[PDB]
Design a binder for this molecule. Structure first.
Ligand SMILES: O=C(Cc1cccc(Cl)c1)Nn1cn[nH]c1=O
Ligand SMILES: O=C(Cc1cccc(Cl)c1)Nn1cn[nH]c1=O
Lengths: 304, 304
């Protein structure tokens, strides 16, 4: 027992990290097969970032201007192309450490692990959620660009995020591996509005189920609610409206605990309306929304 | 910017995990060079665990009774010996993936990453602290025994923990890599008292410094305190007494922020006495003690 904010083991991703340098700029790249993927802003200088014309900036670059180093060894760049906000550098060597992988575009509210990197070297790993407003609240300093987010299903790594920037608000924005930003963001040093964020209701309910499984049950009450009534409370408290699709995904947890989803909704309603009264749930004094129902099942069953 | 509970990249440790089976029991082992280390209770059945005579139970076992499997391949066991609560199985093949490593015994209040494993396969990684009472609050199910805790300094892995058991209270106990338990615990299914735990004061102060660096500063006040006055408050609230050695380790953070350690102590005193008044610090509604001053510096400087 016990419930922790667990990241996937990062070994398969560590074997893909490389350093990419273009001119004066260095960031991280992801080497899979014979392609290295990195943020296209590796071609910008500080002056360029205020309003870069990426097409024109890339035309001044040749394959030999992109220095790709896999720790000790240098990769030979034989092609370059820009796809949305990513550059794809074709190298003459397939990464011997390429795991089975997929590129996926995750949905807001889904979770993933991030391997924070600097100069092509992994510094740490943490689990996070894609906010409903398509930002992530990460830990990324200058040079972390190109660090990736991923999930792992047995031996297959699904890459879902590449880090590109920190908004002036301190939250993070990035793309899928085809270079499409999550959210309205553009790769330009301009103030950019992140939409109104909300709490991921289905994840908070999943986490309350994890809490009951792991011994914390003080918040369970004698009440029930309906989706309509619960959603009036979700509205007041900036929680995502709960749908039958969310109730359905909570099915396995409801079955394992014997606590009907609407009954857990009534516990959540009372916690929203009354707070925690100075108590904790799974070591947290707030309602945690970074665990999906799949995360809770995986962690509670010991999947490898 | 941004501050997360970050674990070390686990790749170097994933390459050392193996499955160890003895009779009906399977758990994880750590293969380094030509030795596999695992909890000695791999030799016990359920009946044995109430009061095992490990010496007698080990005498009924031969090298061929220990099945060691490194994912796909079987290791040949050519020796076995018990050292404290660990078994050391000498194998005929050195692990080709053995990283540079050390065995260290960490101090209470220090942090480390855990690679949770089942059947020799890594499931996830999380960061945690060794409590002042020598327990850890982990995420470990049946079969996670043998999963290890570690820190990484560039290319060197310092292994500090091997998981052995879950106390009836749901907290976790284990050993260093020489098989010595942290704390008063014994590897027996008996109710065992974990001492009174305390909050790791130096870590909470380090985390308040991380909060100021990363933009959260509402808790800073116009006050100062002394070590004696602060320790009277630490006493009332079950915090570890602060010493000059702790003040000294906070030196770099005090220098970087310009906030004297005793002034941060006065902010901590007011937070202990008044609570958070429904506010958060680095996304937490409680005072976080799982980041050491070294962790905060490492994370804030981007060390790889
Ligand atoms: O944000 C940037 C550079 C950048 C600035 C503006 C736009 C773009 Cl695409 C990139 N780096 N950065 C700084 N702290 N964290 C982090 O990721
Ligand atoms: O605690 C044990 C077995 C055990 C029981 C009693 C003593 C000893 Cl040494 C081992 N496994 N376990 C169960 N949930 N988490 C976890 O680690």
């Amino acid at each position: 027992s016990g419930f922790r904010k667990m990241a996937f083991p990062s070994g398969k991703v560590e074997g893909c990290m490389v350093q990419v340098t273009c001119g004066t700029t260095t960031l991280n790249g992801l080497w899979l097969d014979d392609v290295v993927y990195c943020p296209r802003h590796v071609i910008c200088t500080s002056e360029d970032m205020l309003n870069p014309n990426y097409e024109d900036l890339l035309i001044r670059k040749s394959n030999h201007n992109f220095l790709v180093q896999a720790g000790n060894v240098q990769l030979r760049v034989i092609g370059h192309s820009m796809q949305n906000c990513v550059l794809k550098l074709k190298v003459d060597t397939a990464n011997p450490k390429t795991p089975k992988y997929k590129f996926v575009r995750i949905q807001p509210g889904q979770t993933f692990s991030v391997l924070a990197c600097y100069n092509g070297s992994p510094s740490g790993v943490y689990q996070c959620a894609m906010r409903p407003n398509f930002t992530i609240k990460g830990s990324f300093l200058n040079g972390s660009c190109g660090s990736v987010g991923f999930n792992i299903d047995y031996d297959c790594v699904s890459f879902c995020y590449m880090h590109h920037m920190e908004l002036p608000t301190g939250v993070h924005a990035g793309t899928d591996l085809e270079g499409n930003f999550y959210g309205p963001f553009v790769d330009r040093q301009t103030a950019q509005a992140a939409g109104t964020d909300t709490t991921i209701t289905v994840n908070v309910l999943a986490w309350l189920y994890a809490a009951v499984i792991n011994g914390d049950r003080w918040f369970l009450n004698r009440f029930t609610t309906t989706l309509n009534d619960f959603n009036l409370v979700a509205m007041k408290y900036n929680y995502e409206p709960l749908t039958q699709d969310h109730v359905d995904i909570l099915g396995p947890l409801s079955a394992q605990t014997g606590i009907a989803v609407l009954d857990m909704c009534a516990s959540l309603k009372e916690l929203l309306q009354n707070g925690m009264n100075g108590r904790t749930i799974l070591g947290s004094a707030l309602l945690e929304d970074e665990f999906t129902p799949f995360d809770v099942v995986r962690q509670c069953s010991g999947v490898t």
